[PDB]
Ligand code: HEM
Ligand SMILES: CCOC(=O)C1=C(C)NC(C)=C(C(=O)OC)[C@H]1c1cccc(Cl)c1Cl
């Protein structure tokens with residue numbers, strides 16, 4: 001007894017009824033007819049959609065174990081092979097994630113904290129921006145280099161110089177693969193596997209980049225193996241290699257070189273383009289809202305000053321900036337459909353029964369835009385996370401990282417990168433628009449797995 005939904009056509013399901021360019025819009029329209037929980041078919045594949053806070057919470061949190069599975073696809077299994085953290089399930093997922101979470105703690109990988117790595121990067125970032133000489137530029141590239149380098153310093157210990165060719169090509173490959181995987185065409189191909197044959201060049205391009213990135217990570221890990229100091233872990237790779245030694249006797253161990261390469265790649269995949277996009281969107285919203293930027297820079301002046309680089313301790317004394325960062329994530333709505341889940345067993349949800357392995361879609365965007373929790377949800381307003389006295393007001397509806405047992409495995413790092421990159425940038429620069437601010441639109445242009453802000457130019461004027 002699956003939840004009701006639009007009547008599917010024999011082979012293509014409800015595909016012709018949904019806009020592949022803005023699936024969330026189609027799902028939202030369906031919730032107005034069928035309610036908070038409904039079933040749609042993409043080809044022969046059923047997908048139960050959860051719309052609204054009550055439905056999303058009950059699924060991801062109150063029935064967390066049952067809803068902790070990762071909804072997989074033919075393309076995912078072909079790229080990852082079920083290795084790593086993003087696309088794995090069962091025992092492998094639990095072990096790799098548990099380890100990943102503990103080593104991604106601020107001091108979970110040695111004497112050097114993750115925060116110190118992000119601060120060094122925030123510093124290198126402001127220096128690259130100074131080289132633009134306050135002239136108009138598309139910040140896309142420079143803003144993408146920082147989060148990528150953060151992951152690099154987290155897994156390879158040392159960051160790369162921005163001019164390093166190995167860094168440049170490594171970044172271009174992840175960029176190429178991101179663009180292909182962000183296309184509405186992958187939705188069609190995942191549900192109609194035969195159509196993948198209609199894209200030989202793209203298929204080969206993706207496979208090639210994954211192969212090259214794989215061998216690169218493997219060359220890096222071999223370097224770590226021949227210089228490992230068990231008492232002094234330098235990064236993520238050292239920690240994994242140390243765990244592998246402790247599990248050397250057990251042959252049914254998930255901690256092997258195969259899962260290590262996949263996990264490192266996954267951190268890059270899940271942590272580079274997502275943070276980069278939020279950083280771009282953030283600067284766009286700050287550019288468009290001068291009044292908001294001013295109050296943030298004022299709070300920075302008061303709590304941090306002009307002679308010291310910001311740090312995470314400062315966030316506790318900067319409620320407005322915290323509210324701004326939260327509002328940037330709520331408004332930007334990066335992953336509107338969330339990442340697909342799958343129930344681990346036959347699950348009972350209210351008066352419905354969802355069979356094992358069925359794909360789950362918890363609409364994060366429907367929570368982020370709840371019109372009661374956030375009056376006027378389509379307006380960017382830091383007040384949505386501020387109380388009557390200007391203090392930070394937390395929200396149960398703040399789910400940009402999803403919720404439950406599968407919530408973003410790098411949420412702390414993500415929030416840290418956002419707070420630090422934005423405060424360090426605004427401490428050293430003012431944001432100038434080329435044209436009039438009225439002409440600047442902030443509505444997301446594309447919505448296919450990852451919502452992207454419109455293209456824009458900006459001038460970084462040193463304070
Ligand atoms: C502002 C940027 C980011 C946002 C909004 C974000 C969002 C999310 C979301 C919505 C998911 C899917 C959760 C689910 O399964 O329901 C996810 C998963 C994940 N995130 Fe992030 N993320 C970001 C950055 C990071 C960073 C910096 C890292 C790197 C350590 C990272 C690592 C992961 C991983 C490994 C997963 C998969 C977890 C699993 O399957 O168990 N993310 N993230
Ligand atoms: C930012 C790029 O993310 C991806 O390319 C994803 C992959 C490799 N796989 C799947 C299953 C994803 C998806 O369908 O998202 C809707 C993403 C992904 C994985 C983990 C975290 C995030 Cl935020 C994303 Cl977008």
Ligand SMILES: CCCCCCCCCCCCCCCC(=O)O
Pocket residue numbers: 075078079180183185186189196199202203206207
């Ligand atoms: C080994 C992994 C194989 C993965 C194969 C994935 C195939 C995806 C095909 C996507 C086609 C994208 C077309 C984009 C068109 C455009 O906008 O220019």
